Structures are given as structure tokens and as C-alpha cells.
Amino acid sequence: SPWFGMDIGGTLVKLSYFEPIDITAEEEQEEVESLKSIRKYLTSNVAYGSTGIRDVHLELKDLTLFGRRGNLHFIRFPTQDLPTFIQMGRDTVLCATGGGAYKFEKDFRTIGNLHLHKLDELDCLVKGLLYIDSVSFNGQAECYYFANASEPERCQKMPFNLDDPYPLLVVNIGSGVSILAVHSKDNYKRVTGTSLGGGTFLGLCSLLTGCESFEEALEMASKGDSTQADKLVRDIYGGDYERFGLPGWAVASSFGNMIYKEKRESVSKEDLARATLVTITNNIGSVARMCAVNEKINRVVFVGNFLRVNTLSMKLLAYALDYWSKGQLKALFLEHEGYFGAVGALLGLPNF
Amino acid sequence: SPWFGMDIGGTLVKLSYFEPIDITAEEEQEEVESLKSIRKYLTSNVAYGSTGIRDVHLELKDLTLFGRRGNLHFIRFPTQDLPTFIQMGRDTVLCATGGGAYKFEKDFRTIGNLHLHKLDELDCLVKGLLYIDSVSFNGQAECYYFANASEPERCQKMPFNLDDPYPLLVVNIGSGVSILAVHSKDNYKRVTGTSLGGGTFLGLCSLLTGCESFEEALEMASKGDSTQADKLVRDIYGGDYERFGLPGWAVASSFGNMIYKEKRESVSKEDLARATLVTITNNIGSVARMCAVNEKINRVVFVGNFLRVNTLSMKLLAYALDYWSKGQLKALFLEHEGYFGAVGALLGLPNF
Ligand SMILES: Nc1ncnc2c1ncn2[C@@H]1O[C@H](COP(=O)(O)OP(=O)(O)NP(=O)(O)O)[C@@H](O)[C@H]1O
Numbered sequence: 293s294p295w296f297g298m299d300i301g302g303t304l305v306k307l308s309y310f311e312p313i314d315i316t317a318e319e320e321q322e323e324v325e326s327l328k329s330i331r332k333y334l335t336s337n338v339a340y341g342s343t344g345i346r347d348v349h350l351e352l353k354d355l356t357l358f359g360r361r362g363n364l365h366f367i368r369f370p371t372q373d374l375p376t377f378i379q380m381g382r383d384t385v386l387c388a389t390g391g392g393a394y395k396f397e398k399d400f401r402t403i404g405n406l407h408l409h410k411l412d413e414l415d416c417l418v419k420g421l422l423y424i425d426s427v428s429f430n431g432q433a434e435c436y437y438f439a440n441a442s443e444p445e446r447c448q449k450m451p452f453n454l455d456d457p458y459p460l461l462v463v464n465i466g467s468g469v470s471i472l473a474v475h476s477k478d479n480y481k482r483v484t485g486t487s488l489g490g491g492t493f494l495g496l497c498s499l500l501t502g503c504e505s506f507e508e509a510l511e512m513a514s515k516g517d518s519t520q521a522d523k524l525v526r527d528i529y530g531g532d533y534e535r536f537g538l539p540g541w542a543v544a545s546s547f548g549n550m551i552y553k554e555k556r557e558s559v560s561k562e563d564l565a566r567a568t569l570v571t572i573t574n575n576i577g578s579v580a581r582m583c584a585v586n587e588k589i590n591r592v593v594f595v596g597n598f599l600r601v602n603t604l605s606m607k608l609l610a611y612a613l614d615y616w617s618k619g620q621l622k623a624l625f626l627e628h629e630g631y632f633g634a635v636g637a638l639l640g641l642p643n644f
Numbered sequence: 645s646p647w648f649g650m651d652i653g654g655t656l657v658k659l660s661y662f663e664p665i666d667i668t669a670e671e672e673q674e675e676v677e678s679l680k681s682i683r684k685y686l687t688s689n690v691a692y693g694s695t696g697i698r699d700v701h702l703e704l705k706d707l708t709l710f711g712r713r714g715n716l717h718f719i720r721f722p723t724q725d726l727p728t729f730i731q732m733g734r735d736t737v738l739c740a741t742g743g744g745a746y747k748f749e750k751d752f753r754t755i756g757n758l759h760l761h762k763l764d765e766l767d768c769l770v771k772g773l774l775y776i777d778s779v780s781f782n783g784q785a786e787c788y789y790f791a792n793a794s795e796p797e798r799c800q801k802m803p804f805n806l807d808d809p810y811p812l813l814v815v816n817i818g819s820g821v822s823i824l825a826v827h828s829k830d831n832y833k834r835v836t837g838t839s840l841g842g843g844t845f846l847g848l849c850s851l852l853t854g855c856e857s858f859e860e861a862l863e864m865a866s867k868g869d870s871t872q873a874d875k876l877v878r879d880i881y882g883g884d885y886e887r888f889g890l891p892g893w894a895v896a897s898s899f900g901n902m903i904y905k906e907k908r909e910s911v912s913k914e915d916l917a918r919a920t921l922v923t924i925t926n927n928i929g930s931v932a933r934m935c936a937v938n939e940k941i942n943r944v945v946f947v948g949n950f951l952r953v954n955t956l957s958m959k960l961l962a963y964a965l966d967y968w969s970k971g972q973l974k975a976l977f978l979e980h981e982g983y984f985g986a987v988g989a990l991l992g993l994p995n996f
């Protein structure tokens with residue numbers, strides 16, 4: 293059977309697919325036409341139907357996995373479209389994680405003789421994260437940070453070594469937010485979570501602006517001015533609040549200027565999109581900072597698909613974590629940020 | 645001069661006024677007509693102009709302050725209307741705190757010979773809180789909690805003794821949120837803050853529902869179902885997430901169901917108001933819980949005017965703090981929750 297790892301989240305399904313590249317002439321004969329059809333379908337297309345996408349730039353080439361060489365592919369589609377995926381599959385050992393491994397268990401079992409093995413969402417995240425970092429991103433660093441995040445003329449993406457990754461605070465920004473403290477490969481805890489996550493950004497953005505997609509929400513936010521909607525320290529004090537080191541530019545009340553009817557009538561959709569992004573991102577950074585201080589961990593890695601093609605939020609996290617921690621915490625980012633659960637599920641295959 | 649304490653916040657001005665009740669016959673003669681006019685104006689009206697309100701139920705009767713007996717009155721009006729207040733004053737030693745003591749300093753100085761003494765917002769909060777608790781609420785407890793907050797058939801307001809109040813975590817929910825750790829009467833720190841506060845509730849509520857007042861926002865929220873807008877754990881897992889003790893009813897993504905166009909088209913304004921209230925309140929409780937664990941403090945008192953006439957948020961905080969802390973933290977509430985800064989400012993008068 294094909295080697296697949298699936299993470300069915302509240303919003304997106306993430307799929308890792310291992311394509312063998314060391315197929316012998318004899319093995320090619322013993323391949324059934326459906327298996328050959330699957331491999332060619334997945335490797336000859338980058339869009340699958342109307343909503344599936346292969347993230348070609350993330351492909352790991354010539355990986356040795358389970359004693360065979362191949363390429364590891366990364367594919368995503370909305371959980372709303374899982375019925376289409378299952379229906380395509382009805383006309384294999386599936387290691388699956390995420391909440392949908394439980395919610396849609398009976399649906400996967402409509403595929404005759406399919407064996408479904410449910411694996412824990414956070415166990416898979418930790419295993420997949422450690423694995424991808426260990427094999428590298430085709431010889432490049434999987435982990436990076438923004439150097440000199442305080443100075444914009446100098447702020448630049450730089451590689452970060454995670455050879456001894458422990459301890460590590462993992463902030464998983466998906467529909468909601470989970471925060472993990474990782475002390476060893478077999479010792480980790482879910483410290484807490486917050487419900488102000490990627491789904492809050494997209495849901496509030498759609499309500500406030502009428503945007504119809506995540507990418508559209510980000511494009512609006514890139515054009516907006518969040519201070520048209522937010523009430524800042526300087527709006528309350530006239531300047532800094534010096535006694536407690538709060539700069540005038542800090543947000544005192546997110547959307548707090550929207551209590552005034554005249555300001556609601558002048559704010560643009562782009563301003564509201566940016567205020568939503570800033571509100572959600574700052575809250576995540578602040579919760580991450582409190583968890584790091586309590587866990588006595590100084591390396592904070594942010595994963596999940598809220599940060600896909602979202603440099604605004606990454607730069608805001610990098611700057612805010614460094615600024616508000618007075619340089620004691622560092623924001624770390626991973627190239628394969630949305631796919632670690634799917635990889636960890638795939639890695640569970642030898643157990644079964 | 646009249647004895648007044650003023651806290652000029654980002655949204656509301658809070659005023660504490662001490663009315664002497666031991667005026668002798670000779671003192672009444674030496675009272676200038678303007679002073680008599682002020683005292684009679686304040687004590688014979690409960691509404692001042694179109695936006696000032698005296699909270700008569702909070703009055704402290706027959707208090708001994710600065711060696712005189714009198715009644716302590718509590719008055720509020722929007723900071724937007726401070727120009728009207730100052731203009732009324734132009735046709736006294738003023739101890740003032742809050743950001744507006746700085747922002748509007750030059751405006752207060754347009755009142756001839758007025759001496760303005762700016763006092764720190766959080767120093768005044770701590771001093772006023774400790775003072776009011778010490779003198780009691782006309783012989784009743786100033787501090788209360790909700791007993792058996794987990795069981796609704798039993799949940800009831802009960803008094804709480806703060807005779808030895810230290811240590812104490814104070815969560816001040818105003819326009820934004822400040823969190824204080826109080827170790828003694830002269831030893832306290834601002835632990836952190838969040839910008840998701842009362843102004844976020846009111847601003848987002850107005851954008852989403854068109855409500856025109858705080859009280860209207862709360863009335864809408866009392867009629868709504870937040871789960872029409874929020875994505876719950878059971879929407880993602882089909883039930884509880886047992887491995888990490890997350891019940892199916894917990895919110896996984898605030899407004900997370902609003903990523904679906906069909907759900908945006910069926911949600912009511914009341915549902916959105918309630919989802920806004922729940923989102924903001926849960927975030928405040930969660931940040932409070934993390935700060936309490938880090939500060940090693942188990943008593944968490946919530947103040948500020950976000951909780952005025954807001955039993956929904958108080959009960960949600962009481963339940964959530966107890967539930968998510970597994971009974972280790974207790975949510976405490978104070979009858980004079982919005983006025984402690986104004987009282988603390990008044991208490992600074994003997995310094996000058
Ligand atoms: N193409 C997209 N469609 C939808 N959401 C996207 C997309 N791209 C990025 N996002 C963001 O990614 C978030 C989902 O991230 P993801 O890590 O895949 O969550 P999930 O695993 O599906 N949810 P969860 O059950 O909470 O773990 C959304 O809330 C958006 O903020």
C-alpha cells in the first residue's frame with residue numbers, strides 16, 4: 293500500500309506522501325494499476341480537484357525512510373472537502389491524527405478493508421517536528437529566526453540550529469492554539485491553549501470585511517492601519533506610560549477606538565483586517581511569553597498554518613517576543629510548519 | 645475646597661466625592677455660595693447633564709475620613725465628555741489618576757488657581773481597594789465570590805474575608821486589562837496586561853451588531869448562543885479530547901465557525917454579541933490563571949467596569965477559573981469594582 297500520513301484538523305487536512313524512487317523493474321510489474329494510477333496522479337499534478345494543493349517547494353528529495361529511498365511530498369485540502377477525498381478513495385493502512393481521525397473514523401471505514409490507526413495529535417506533532425529537523429530541509433536548516441527583529445533595516449531571516457532541541461516550547465497555531473512544553477523526545481506536556489487562533493482571525497475577518505479566503509484576508513491586512521481601530525497607550529496617556537515601561541505605541545485596547553460611532557464610520561476594511569491580525573498575533577505571543585516564563589524555557593517555536601504565507605504575523609511575533617521579553621526569549625519558525633502532525637503519523641506506520 | 649478623587653480612564657471618568665455631614669452652624673456660614681451650590685447639586689441629583697450618573701447604591705454612609713464624618717459618593721461619566729465637565733468647572737486641589745490625569749493636565753489647568761496632583765493609576769487602585777475593604781460596605785463585605793460555581797442549581801454570591809489580603813492578584817478590566825501582584829501594602833508589581841479588554845468587547849460588539857451602548861451589548865449577549873459562532877472541541881473531535889482533558893464543550897476556536905459562509909448567514913446579532921463576551925471573558929480568565937500560577941498566588945480579584953451590571957461575565961469567570969484550575973484558584977469580586985482608583989486618589993489629598 294502507499295505510505296501516507298494524515299492530520300485531519302478542524303480546518304485543513306494535511307497529507308504527507310512518501311514516493312519511492314528506487315523501484316526495481318520487477319517491483320514495477322507487481323504494482324497494481326490502481327497503485328500506479330495513484331502515484332502518477334499525485335506526482336504529475338500540483339492541484340487536486342478544486343481545493344487540493346501540493347506544496348512542491350517543501351518536498352524532501354531522496355529521503356531514506358523505512359529502508360527505502362524516496363521523496364516526501366506535502367499536500368493539503370480543506371477538512372470540509374474530506375467527503376470528496378473519501379469518495380475518490382472508494383472507487384491500505386492509514387495512520388491518521390488530528391481531531392478528524394476520531395470524528396471521521398466511521399467514514400474512513402467505508403473504504404473496504406482499510407485499516408485506520410488513530411494517533412495522538414500532539415504526539416505526532418512532536419515526533420514529526422523532531423524528525424524533519426533531524427533530516428534537514430534538503431541540506432538547509434529547517435528552523436529559522438528573524439535576526440535583529442527590533443531594527444527593520446536589519447531584520448532578516450537566519451537559520452537556527454536545533455541539534456539539541458530540549459527544552460522547547462511549541463506553539464501550534466491552527467484553528468485554535470495549543471502550547472506544548474517539550475523536555476525530551478518522550479517527555480512533553482500540553483501546557484495550555486487559547487481559543488484565539490487562526491480560525492478567529494479568519495472568522496472575524498470574514499465577518500468584518502467580507503473577505504472570502506485566508507489569502508484575501510492577509511492581502512487586506514497588508515494594506516491596513518491597525519491603529520485606526522485600536523486604542524493605544526498614547527491615546528489614553530498622551531504618550532508613554534513611563535512608570536510601567538509601556539510605550540505610547542503599544543495597544544491598550546484592541547478595537548477600542550471602535551466604541552466611537554464616528555470612528556466606526558471612517559475605518560476601512562483593510563484597517564479592520566490588520567487590526568484583527570495584530571490582535572490575534574499579539575495575544576498568541578503574549579500567552580507564549582507567559583508560558584515560557586512559567587516553564588523556564590527560552591526557545592519558542594511557532595508552528596501551524598496560521599503562519600503559512602503570513603510574514604506579517606511572523607515578523608510581529610519575532611519583534612514582540614524579543615521586545616516584551618527584553619531579549620530573553622527568541623521566536624523560532626520552521627519551514628514545514630503546518631505538516632509536522634502528518635509526518636509524525638506517517639512515522640507510526642512500522643508499529644502496525 | 646471640596647474633597648474629590650478622580651480617575652480619568654481611556655473610557656470612563658470615575659469620581660469619588662466626600663460629603664461632610666458634621667457641618668456646624670458656623671461652618672455653614674463660612675461656606676461660599678459656589679461651594680454650597682456644588683454640594684447641593686451633587687447630592688440632590690442622581691443624573692448630571694446627559695451622561696453623568698451617581699451610583700447611589702454604592703454610597704458609603706457616615707465614614708470618618710481625614711478626621712471628619714461624611715458620606716462617600718461614587719460618580720461616573722464618559723471621558724469623551726470631560727470637556728463639558730471642565731467647562732462647567734470654569735464658570736481646589738484635585739488629586740487625579742488614570743491616563744487622563746496626564747493627557748488632560750493642561751485642560752485642568754484652565755481652571756484658575758486649580759492645583760492638579762497626578763497620582764499613579766495602579767498605586768491608587770491598590771490603595772483604594774485596600775481602604776474600601778478595610779472600612780467595609782456599610783458593615784457588609786466588600787469582597788464576594790460565587791460559591792459552588794460549577795453547579796448552577798447551587799451557584800450563589802457569598803461574602804469573602806480579605807482581612808489579610810496578601811498576596812493578591814488584581815485583574816483590572818477596563819479599556820484594556822492590567823494584572824497586578826500585590827504582596828504588601830507597599831510591595832506590588834504590574835505582572836503584565838492584555839489588550840483584549842472591555843473596549844474590545846464594546847468595540848467588536850458595535851462593529852458586529854450595531855449596538856449603541858454597553859448595556860445594549862450585554863442585553864443582546866444574554867439572548868445569544870455563542871456556540872453558533874464558536875468552533876468547539878466536539879466540532880473537531882466529535883466529542884471530548886480525552887488525552888488532554890479537554891471537554892467537548894470547550895471553545896477550540898473563537899468565532900471559528902464564521903469561516904463558513906453559510907454559518908455567517910444564519911448567525912444572529914445576539915449570538916455574535918454573546919460570542920464576543922465569551923471570547924473576551926475566557927481570555928481574561930486564562931491570562932489571569934497563568935499569571936496566578938507564575939506568581940504563586942491563589943486569590944484572584946477582578947475589578948474594573950467591564951464587570952459592572954455584567955453577571956454573565958462574573959459567573960463565567962467564577963466557573964472557568966475554578967474549572968480550569970481544578971479548584972486551585974478562586975475568582976473574587978468587589979462591590980466597588982470600578983472606583984478604587986478614584987478613592988485612592990482622594991486618599992492622597994493629605995500629602996498636599
Ligand atoms: N488555505 C487555507 N485555508 C484555510 N485556512 C488557512 C489556509 N491557509 C492558512 N490558513 C490558516 O491556517 C489555520 C489552520 O491551521 P492548521 O494548523 O491547518 O489547523 P487545524 O489543524 O486544521 N486546526 P486544529 O484542529 O485546531 O489543530 C486557519 O485557521 C487559517 O488561519
Ligand SMILES: Nc1ncnc2c1ncn2[C@@H]1O[C@H](COP(=O)(O)OP(=O)(O)NP(=O)(O)O)[C@@H](O)[C@H]1O
Binds near residue numbers: 742842947949950
Ligand atoms: N456606561 C458605560 N460606558 C462605557 N463603558 C462601560 C460602561 N459601563 C461599563 N462599561 C465597560 O467598562 C469598560 C471600561 O472600564 P473602566 O474600568 O472604567 O476603564 P478605564 O479606566 O476608563 N480604561 P483604562 O484607561 O484602560 O484603565 C468599558 O470598556 C466597558 O466594557
Ligand SMILES: CS(=O)(=O)Nc1ccc(CC(=O)N2CCN(c3ccc(C#N)nn3)CC2)cc1
Binds near residue numbers: 542820
Ligand atoms: C495602563 S492603560 O490605561 O494604558 N491600559 C492598558 C491596558 C493593557 C495594556 C496592554 C499590555 O499591558 N500589554 C503588555 C504586553 N503585551 C504583549 C504583547 C506581545 C507579546 C509577545 N510576544 N508580549 N506581551 C501586550 C500589551 C496596555 C495598557
Ligand SMILES: CS(=O)(=O)Nc1ccc(CC(=O)N2CCN(c3ccc(C#N)nn3)CC2)cc1
Binds near residue numbers: 896
Ligand atoms: C486540540 S483541538 O484541535 O481541539 N484545538 C484546540 C485549541 C485550543 C483550545 C483551547 C484551550 O486549550 N483552552 C484551555 C484553557 N482555557 C481556559 C479558559 C478560561 C480559563 C479561566 N479562568 N482558563 N483557561 C481556554 C481553552 C482547545 C482546543
Ligand SMILES: [Mg+2]
Binds near residue numbers: 390633
Ligand atoms: Mg492541527
Ligand SMILES: [Mg+2]
Binds near residue numbers: 653654742818819985
Ligand atoms: Mg482604569
